[PDB]
Amino acid sequence: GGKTTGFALIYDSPEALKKFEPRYRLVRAGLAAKVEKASRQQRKQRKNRLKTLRGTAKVKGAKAKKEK
Amino acid sequence: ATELTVQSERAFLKQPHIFLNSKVKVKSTRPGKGGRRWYKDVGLGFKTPKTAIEGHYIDKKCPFTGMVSIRGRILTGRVVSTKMHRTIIIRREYLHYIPKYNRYEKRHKNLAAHVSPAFRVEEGDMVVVGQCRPLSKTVRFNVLRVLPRT
Amino acid sequence: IVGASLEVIKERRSMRPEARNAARLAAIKESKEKKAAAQAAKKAEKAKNAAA
Amino acid sequence: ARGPKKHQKRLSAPSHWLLDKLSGAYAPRPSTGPHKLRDCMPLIVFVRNRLKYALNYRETKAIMMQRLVKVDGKVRTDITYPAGFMDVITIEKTGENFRLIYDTKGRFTVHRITDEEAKYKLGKVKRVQLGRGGVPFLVTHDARTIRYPDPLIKVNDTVKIDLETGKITDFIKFDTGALAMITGGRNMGRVGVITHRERHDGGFGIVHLKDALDNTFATRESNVFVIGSEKPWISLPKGKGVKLTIAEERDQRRARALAAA
Amino acid sequence: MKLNISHPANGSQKLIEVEDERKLRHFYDKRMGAEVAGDPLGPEWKGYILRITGGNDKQGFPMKQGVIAPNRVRLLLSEGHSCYRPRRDGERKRKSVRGCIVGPDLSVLALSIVKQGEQDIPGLTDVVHPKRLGPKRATKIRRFFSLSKDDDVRKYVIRREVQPKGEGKKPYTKAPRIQR
RNA sequence: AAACUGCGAAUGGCUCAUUAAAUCAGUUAUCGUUUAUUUGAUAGUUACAUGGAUAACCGUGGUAAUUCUAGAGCU
């Protein structure tokens, strides 16, 4: 056929749009940019890998010099 | 029932929280208040037997002059064994329906109940029992009335 | 302690009580005019209330 | 099973929630509260599935975080809050109030109410006795406890609650000739007049009612909710709960259709 | 065989290596928490008395106060014990620890100075390490600087000057959040 | 950031080995008990503020080896 049906949302203000409207549609429309992240498996690997360090896990190279 | 003596045991039998040795004597109509024998009524149109009010027996499982409340089902039956101490066995008969053959067959079950010294029960009699809290391994009912003999 | 040198800690702890008493009176006084200024500022709001 | 449950499977939810068997595997699982789990009206289902104000779950939970919706004059912020019979839900921004009441088919329906009448409730009393210190009190069906009540008030009656001060303005006795609505059983939505009551010693009595159209029905006392003697205090919904049979239901449906167009 | 010697007064610690056994003979058969004289250890230690604080075996297991044995024994360490940190409430794990009686088998001793001697140590008693921070409660501050009931304790508080990385502006001051 | 403290981790997901009045089903009772949480009521016999520890942290070690740990100095 030649007819098409969809859904529409009309907002009072553009700021009200960004306050309640979901992000992925914003990416669809181009208003907002996409978020860059690593894959789900790599993120999962990192989180459990940091469970083996105790205190200030951000830098852990101080134990590399123990062997001399 | 037939009991020769009331105090024939190692310990002393008495109703709990019934004060019996007061210097001043006061006469009151209330059963338990004045210091004399205490008793209650179960309900459901069941009348307290006359022998209970003036009897001297001590029992903590009788629905009258006892600490047991009656709630649940009420059943009726025929006594088949009453030759042990303060407990009887009744026999109940019913009909089970087999759907395929469109006819019935007889079945039966055995039940254990506690009998108070107020009643006198002999073999082959109708009794009415009521549910109560677990009193033993296999005793959960108490006799309330003995129907007249044919 | 690292923040304060040994000379500082001894002198600070050993400040004379009479000097401390003067210090208290000095400290209280500026707060007292500042509180009076608080009533003067409240008068400033009172003037604003009169104006509108 | 090693503790209490916290998940509820779809296809096991109460029927009167009217949830589709497709589009997901789980259900809202209403949280604990003042109303029974079996017959309650979760706030998320009411806001999203009936009023159609919120499209899905994500903004549905946002709505309560903005504190826009309140029940009984007090704001609630949990999506699975158990609402129930006679409770009043108020949305000020749009400007209307709702009361949850069964329809004649046994499910909750939307019912506009006026603002002046939407500021009080009424509920059946469950137990009355004196508490600690000798102070008498009673508790109704919606977990409302009130101290120092009228001594003549007994159990199974109904009492009118102000909902702002919680004071006992008025009450209705439970006797023959009163107007009642059924709350449990297969007889969902019916309204009738008490004809006579028959009691059975040992529990589980039955009461006989009579409808305005000379219909007859009976129900347990635990399912009767008296709402007036005559001229019921609350405003009944459309149809007044008369339970027309299917023959006239189809006759009226075609009559109304032809009448409109 | 290493030695970890500490000076609590100066907040200074040092590590020494000892390979000659007859100097270490007088430590044998001593118990954890005891007092010993350091005179046989060397001439620079004359007038020193030391407290035995702990040690480690060659295998790496630590010494436990209260267990009398020269070998090592297995124990069911619960919560609150010394050499165990549980990972879950009420959890107990079986570990192996060495007794509190000193012997030739252990690899390193840890001990501290109790009384200062006439002689000085080249790398231990000549330096003092600053405490990182100071008191944080109002009562502690008052007791420390010996103030009275009303003396406006707010002014009297240690201040450490910190500066940003490279903004080029002047540094500012940071404060310890007086409690109570 | 790190760390103490609070809560959850006893829900979910998988399988059908054992089990013949046992499990289970419909129907009752708890006047015979425990109950986090949610909801509603409810408690008139130095004080302008009490006391010691501990984590994070600085710095020094042991074991080929683990989400192993010691003793010393702060809050």
Next chain:
RNA sequence: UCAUAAUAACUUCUCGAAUCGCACGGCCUUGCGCCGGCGAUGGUUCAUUCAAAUUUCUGCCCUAUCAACUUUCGACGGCUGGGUAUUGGCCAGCCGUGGUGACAACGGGUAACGGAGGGUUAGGGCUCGACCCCGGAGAAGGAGCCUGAGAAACGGCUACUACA
């Protein structure tokens, strides 16, 4: 013998707030004086909710080449206590000799988790149901336990056997 009230006493013995965030206000004896709002987190008892554990009645396949079974060291009932969140032969002492069965007990088989239900049709039936819904049990095989309202838990611990 209920809810609740009163009296004489008792207790290694509880609770009755030394916690946190927003607002900037009002009095006269003008003191760095007094009073005052809304929330968060906690807290004794009652009520409610999600429940949980026990519990009444009736209902399960084939087999007699299974006809008598149960009580050594509880098998049936009575009493005094202990233990448990509570009842109870659940356990400890004393005293009676009971309980089930041809209306099929007891035992042996099951290529047996139970139910809602699937397949096949004149009607009556025969057969299947590990499997998306409800209930029960288990985490290689046995036992024991901490924390916690809730576990005899195994993506919790301890010990033995077999693998590794």
